[PDB]
Structure prediction request, 162 residues.
Amino acid sequence: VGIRFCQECNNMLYPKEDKENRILLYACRNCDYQQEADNSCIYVNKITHEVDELTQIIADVSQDPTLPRTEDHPCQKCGHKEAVFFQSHSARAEDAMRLYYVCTAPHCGHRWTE
Amino acid sequence: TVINNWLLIEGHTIGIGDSIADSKTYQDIQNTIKKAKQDVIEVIEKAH
Ligand SMILES: [Zn+2]
Ligand SMILES: [Zn+2]
Prediction:
């Protein structure tokens, strides 16, 4: 999945085949540094990719003066009443109007979606 | 010619009295507008 780098030349490690022990080795093209990986999966491609933005929503959006606010949706963690909300705010989304919420209490930053 | 010289008797105009409605009509229009805005709000709530 991710990119792993050689410790000698600090270049990308390409996958190379070990035709003796039937094992996967990551080797670079600059030096002869070898490795054994734990992912065991070279490549992964998901075409749905309906990523939940709760990973990508920052908790600092609560300081936006231009966002709507509601008090009928208390925070799950700290029980604070006021909570900002907004829409998906994502391009390349075929169809979405679901709301997202962020707690406005400082240092809480709870970001959920009912 | 005939209609113009007769129109010199009847006359024609356009004014605010011709562009103003009645109180009952104003109430009807405002009611309809409020109902439509409420329905739009309901649709938005269902979408959310
Ligand atoms: Zn290397
Ligand atoms: Zn909270």
